[PDB]
Amino acid sequence: EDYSVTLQILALMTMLGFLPAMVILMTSFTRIVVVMSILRQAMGLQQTPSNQVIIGIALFLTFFVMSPVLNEINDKAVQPYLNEQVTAREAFDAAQAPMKAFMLKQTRIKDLETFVTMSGEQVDNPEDVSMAVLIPAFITSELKTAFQIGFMLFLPFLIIDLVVASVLMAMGMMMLSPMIVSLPFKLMLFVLVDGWNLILSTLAGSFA
Amino acid sequence: EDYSVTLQILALMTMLGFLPAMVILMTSFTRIVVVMSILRQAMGLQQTPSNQVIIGIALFLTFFVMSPVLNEINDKAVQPYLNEQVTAREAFDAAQAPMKAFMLKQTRIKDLETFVTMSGEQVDNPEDVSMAVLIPAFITSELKTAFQIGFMLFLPFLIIDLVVASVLMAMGMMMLSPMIVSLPFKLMLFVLVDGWNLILSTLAGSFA
């Protein structure tokens, strides 16, 4: 007794309503956005890359890295559903399973441990936990992971900033602001290292 | 086979809704704004040019450099469609192609390779790659190219500032901030060389 067609449409329209929530919480969008935010503030440029471009890059990146799970949903939950092979209730479960598996690969056991105790449910295996518990654990792990990557990328720009300030202080020109002179070198290092292609490749490879 | 009048209208309104995205992700708007962002940051003025006029000049600059491609879209796609020479499906493809060609002229081979492997698809010719994968490669190349131009624009202003600081220190006045003295010199040398006209030539002509 699968859900009637009227209820099936009502469920799907509700999922489209929560589409921003699914992208910003259940996907890779948050980690990429935060790492780009740290990198932008690491250099002297405040909002030169602009917010729309940063989100635009992240949206394409989060679509590419989640193409495997997106295809797995299609090949196991959409095509059997359209071919009249699985109950609509079964198809919904078949779509949710790869999404849960992907979120578990990028989560930390400490995050699961605190939220499982917070929910107060007696579950032992770290695979049959509810989405209500998994999603906050996943987004917490993504924020912490983004900070680690953000600190990693920040260090070389801190090195340049300290060197420029030290060299200027060596000549006794303490009045000269190190930030104005430091910025072209920060652009210099990031461009001869091929930073933009490098960071997006690492962010793509990070989700594994 | 061809889309009905009702459906064609729906597609037209949809592209108008995404019009800001097409400007800042497919056209030359991103490179111009980033380069102009460096120019404002290089000089001692922080918000003095203000954000409004920079975007407005960038929009007019884009319409100038996108005029060949926009006219090519007009001739190849709009004119047969208005005269009812071709169907809506092929007219849409005839409009998409000039945009794809322009994005290929402003991208790099390495950037395309990274994203085509990232998408996990099969292709052998760059000319028939999907626009969904070309867009992230296009802007990534645009950001790297803009940083290169901005770095070159930042050097002469760094040159002026370092000279003024050295002169003041050499004269013995270790108490005066170089920024106040250097700012008129940076502005004077920006005007008597007609700096913006030179930047227009190296920015508008950089696409070709």
Partner: peptide
């Protein structure tokens, strides 16, 4: 695949409109 999902949906709507007209 998933990309063709949107294409199929639009074609069905176009076919339904074409038959209705």
């Amino acid at each position: 695949d998933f990309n063709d999902l949107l294409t199929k949906a639009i074609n069905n709507v176009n076919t339904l409109q074409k038959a209705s007209g």
